[PDB]
A paper describes a structure:
The long-wavelength beamline I23 at Diamond Light Source overcomes these limitations and extends the accessible wavelength range to λ = 5.9 Å. Native-SAD uses light atoms naturally occurring in proteins or bound to proteins. We demonstrate that long-wavelength native-SAD has become a very compelling technique, where a low multiplicity dataset from a single crystal can be sufficient for successful structure determination, making it a general vehicle of choice for experimental phasing.
Amongst the structures solved at the beamline, the lowest sulfur content was found in the [name] domain of the protein codified by the locus tag LIC_11128 from [name] Fiocruz L1-130. The domain contains only one sulfur in 116 amino acids (0.9% sulfur content), nevertheless the substructure solution was straightforward in SHELXD22 with 360° of data, a resolution of 2.5 Å, completeness of 83% and an overall multiplicity of 11.
Author numbering:
A (entry chain A): 7 to 116
B (entry chain C): 9 to 116
Write the structure that this text describes.
Amino acid sequence: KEYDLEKLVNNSLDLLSIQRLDGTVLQVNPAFERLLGWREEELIGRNPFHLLHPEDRESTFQEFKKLNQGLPVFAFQNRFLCSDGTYKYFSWTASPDLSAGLIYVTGRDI
Amino acid sequence: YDLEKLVNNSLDLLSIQRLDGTVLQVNPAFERLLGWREEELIGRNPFHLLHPEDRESTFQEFKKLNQGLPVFAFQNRFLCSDGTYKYFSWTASPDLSAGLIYVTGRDI
C-alpha cells in the first residue's frame, strides 16, 4: 500500500508536505524542488520559516497557532524564498492532527 | 498510515485507476470537488463524466499511459453532481507491472 501512496503523492504538481506542530518538515514531494528549487534533503528535518518572507512571518505564525489549536487553514497566502533568490507566492491549505502531532499541507503556486 | 492521512486530507484529487480506466481508489477531494460519493465512482470507468469535446484528447492521453508514458497538467472537463462541467488539470503516472495509473488532479 505504502508504495502506491508514495507514487501518488510524488506525482502531484502541487506541494504536499507533512510538518510537525512546531513546524519541522518531515516530508515533501518533488514539487517543492520544482517550484522552490531546493532539494528535499535541504528542507527535511528543519523548520522552513527561514525561507519565509519577513513581512509574512506574523501572519503565518498566527495560522500556525490556529493549527496548534486544532483548526484547519484554507487558502492562506505567503511568500517563500526560492533557490534563485526570489520570493514566490503560495496558497496553503493545512489540516492538523493533534493526536499524531502532525500537520498535513497542500500548496499551490499563484 | 501517515501517507494515507496526507492523501485523504489533501485539497488535490488523488486516485488509483487500472490501465483500462476502472477507478480503484479515490480520496475525499473527489466528493468535495465533483460532488460524487466514493461508492458511486469506485469500480467504474469515469469516461462517462467526461465532456464529449474532451473525449478524443483524453483517450489519446490514456493510450500514452498504456504505452508507459506519464502525462502532465492535462486539462479536461468532468461532469459534477449538480449537472455542470468543471475544468481539471490532471497528472498521471503509469505502472505497467502493477497495471495501475496514479492520478493527481487540481481544479482550474
